[PDB]
Amino acid sequence: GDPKRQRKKYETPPHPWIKERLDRERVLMDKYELKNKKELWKHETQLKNFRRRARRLLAARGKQAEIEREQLLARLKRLGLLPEDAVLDDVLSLTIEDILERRLQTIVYKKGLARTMRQARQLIVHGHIEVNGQIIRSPSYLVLKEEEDTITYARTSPFANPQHPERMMIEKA
């Protein structure tokens, strides 16, 4: 009899040094400008959990099984990882890049609010980005589809002024 112990939310690679895995992870890190490998492993295990849930639900029968299947599909569609007309089979086709593209940093960069991923990360950390009115300072936050169009400069941040030198530099792109 032992009490609860809070667990890690990421899984380390089975072998620290594999050439192909190291090269692939290095490419992903360079592309998405993540701070360290634990963030990438966190997203990888998120994808793994989704895939495991889909695999378990595929071969399950029962009202609870149908409810869980519907909830999984609805949650993925809400997160924006799958189209509206998706099916459970389409879950297994998800890739790490799909999750990486939903990060607040990536969406901020894509929307043209920052010249580069590093600039977007600094903006998020310093609180120049507001999501649905709230200011979120977590670059790894997964933006929901329903609120993807509400991301913009904080109404009090200097970046909100169109005449700001940094804003003009960003717009010059």
């Binding site: 609180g127 507001e130 009115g133 709230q134 200011i135 979120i136 300072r137 109404r155 009090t156």
Partner: protein, 95 residues
């Protein structure tokens, strides 16, 4: 500083009125208890000597600060019900 009264309730067992409100304000210091009480009393037509602000709580990276207050019917009832610490904080007793 704009105060929006989200909810108002009438407690009759305890002869008071509970007011939940939200203070919207662009970048500015968190409003002081004296200013909040004065504005609330002026807006809602309450007795100044019978209103106690339970709290004015601000959140992370937000321009809306929530606030909870109570307005009693009787000063004696207010003294009998409210604890000493909240009244001292609101400056109703000289301490």
């Amino acid at each position: 500083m704009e105060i929006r009264i989200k909810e108002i309730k009438e407690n009759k067992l305890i002869g008071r009125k509970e007011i939940y409100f939200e203070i919207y304000h662009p970048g500015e210091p968190t409003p002081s208890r004296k200013d909040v009480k004065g504005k609330l009393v002026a807006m809602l037509d309450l007795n100044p000597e019978t209103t106690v602000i339970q709290y004015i709580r601000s959140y992370f990276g937000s321009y809306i600060s929530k606030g909870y207050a109570k307005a009693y019917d009787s000063k004696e009832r207010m003294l009998y019900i409210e604890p000493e610490y909240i009244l001292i904080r609101d400056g109703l007793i000289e301490k």
